[PDB]
């Protein structure tokens, strides 16, 4: 009946139940046109695909199913994704409403199309991605990986100390996600830092890093972020639209990375 709550409570459950929704992939969800879902809806459809065991990336509405050449298997229940309708004021103002979609594995008769390994060394195509992001990446024998907004650079340790390029680039993807949201770019940090503002950042960063790593073929590192799920639980309980604001920032952090990395002069 209430959307923000309804969605926040699914996410609060997943956290308690073990895995927060957005970690569940370890294929990104698509609409009937091939356009990928964004933001909070990627998160929601991921948890939904895990919880119902879906193999397909595609989600349809009853309308999209029927008038495409198919039928929603009766008994099948959809799940709630997010979008905007309009109210009039003086086709005018947007407002957030939910809606129901069904995965392709709940549907019969749909058309035909509908259903790596990196060692321990530098990878050229990954190196080109992060070089094309624009990020000051500095390397030093200091054994910590971090983003310093004050200098505005990412510091990686040396790749060989990782004994895993997959571990090396996931960590970099994570820092690249933080690197967005410096004042010159996405403008996301708190002004005055504390246990709450670090908690928000690394949640945006986490959700965002899953989104990034899904595209780059990497696996996110979740050891580093075990001390926060409680603040996330607390903040998610006290604020029923907080998860929407995080997922929107997260998607913007992934978008900025990939868009820069394709800024072909
Ligand atoms: Mn971080």
Numbering used by the authors: 7 to 32, 40 to 103, 111 to 135, 143 to 292
Task: Give the published text.
R388 has 35 genes assorted in functional groups or modules, among them, a gene coding for an antirestriction protein called ArdC. Interestingly, ArdC contains an N-terminal ssDNA binding domain and a C-terminal metalloprotease domain. ArdC is structurally similar to DNA-binding dependent metalloproteases involved in the maintenance of genetic stability such as Spartan or IrrE. In summary, our results indicate a new mechanism of DNA antirestriction played by protein ArdC, by which plasmids increase their conjugation host range.
The two histidines of the active site helix and the glutamic acid of the glutamate helix have been shown to coordinate a catalytic divalent metal ion, usually zinc. However, gluzinzin metalloproteases maintain the catalytic activity with Co2+, Mn2+ or Ni2+ too due to the flexibility of these three metal coordination geometries. ArdC showed increased thermal stability (assayed by ThermoFluor) in the presence of Ni2+, Mn2+ or Co2+ (ΔTM> 4°C), but not in the presence of Zn2+, Ca2+, Mg2+, Cu2+ or Fe3+. Moreover, to know the conformation of the active site when bound to metals, ArdC was crystallized in the presence of MnCl2. ArdC-Mn crystallized in the P32 space group containing eight molecules per asymmetric unit and the structure was solved at 2.7 Å. Mn2+ is tetrahedrally coordinated by H201, H205, E229 and an H2O molecule. H205 is oriented towards the metal by interaction with the conserved E228 through the non-coordinating nitrogen atom. The E202 residue of the HE202xxH motif orients and acts as a catalytic base for the activation of a water molecule that coordinates the metal. The H2O molecule could act as a Lewis acid to allow the nucleophilic attack. By analogy with other gluzinzin metalloproteases, the conserved ArdC residue Y255 could stabilize by a hydrogen bond the polypeptide chain to be cleaved.
